[PDB]
Amino acid sequence: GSSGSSGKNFNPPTRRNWESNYFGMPLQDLVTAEKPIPLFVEKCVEFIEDTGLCTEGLYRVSGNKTDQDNIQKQFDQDHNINLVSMEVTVNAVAGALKAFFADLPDPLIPYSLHPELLEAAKIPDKTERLHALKEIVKKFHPVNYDVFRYVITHLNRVSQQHKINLMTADNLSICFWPTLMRPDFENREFLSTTKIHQSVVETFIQQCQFFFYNGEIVE
């Protein structure tokens, strides 16, 4: 006899910027007809609201970054994760939510709707301005359109209690400007137009309800 074991040995593989078969594929592929909106996003949105929507600058202030690391990682290795169970800091979940949009292979807003969004934002008639933006947002991809709406739907809630999260529709519209649209550092190489863009985004949120909800025109 005298049968004794010694154990086993091995070495882990390599690691690159990231490892996932989703990043490469477009959202349209990642998501399904049944659920066009990505869980990750929702889980992050519904979470914040559930854990109270009065977190000082949920987006403006993130605090730690490591928190987001596990948020995306753990979620990657396990889609059945429970943010609540982790008991992380709202600020964290907030950032992780955006990061996703930043990873997207393409910008939420297409280049074929850049001038269309501004041309409808510079409109004099307040009402018309909302209508044009309500009809233009219809051209938005049937995959991103759903999300874009869900996201904003939450922002509006944050702007309401800005007195707490010190964040208004305008502030949020800017804090999301990066992802929503990531132009080239050299955006001044050509004629510069009035800061109408910022207004566009901000507007959508402010009047994000009137669009469908038909809520009175707020100010």
- DSSP-derived secondary structure letter, 34: S
Q: Is 63 left (phi over 0), alpha (psi -120 to 50) or beta?
A: left
Burial of residue 163, with CB atoms counted within 10 A of its CB: 0-12 exposed, 13-18 middle, 19 or more buried: exposed
Both structure tokens of 110: 């297409």
Q: Residues 43, 50: contact at Cβ < 8 Å?
A: no
Count the Cβ atoms, other than its own, within 10 Å of residue 186: 7
Count the Cβ atoms, other than its own, within 10 Å of residue 108: 19
Q: Residues 169, 202: contact at Cβ < 8 Å?
A: yes
User: CB within 8 A of 17, min separation 6: which ones?
Assistant: none
Q: Report the distance separating Cα 47 and Cα 34, nearest Å.
A: 21
Both structure tokens of 47: 């979470």
Residues in the chain: 219
Tokens 């707490």 belong to 164
Both structure tokens of 164: 């707490």
Q: Report the distance separating Cα 86 and Cα 71, nearest Å.
A: 9
Domains of the chain and any CATH numbers: 24-215 (1.10.555.10)
**Which technique?**
NMR
Beta strand extents in the chain (DSSP E only): none
- Tell which residues of the chain come right before a gap with C–N over 2.5 A: none
Both structure tokens of 147: 């999300």
Three-class DSSP category at 202? helix
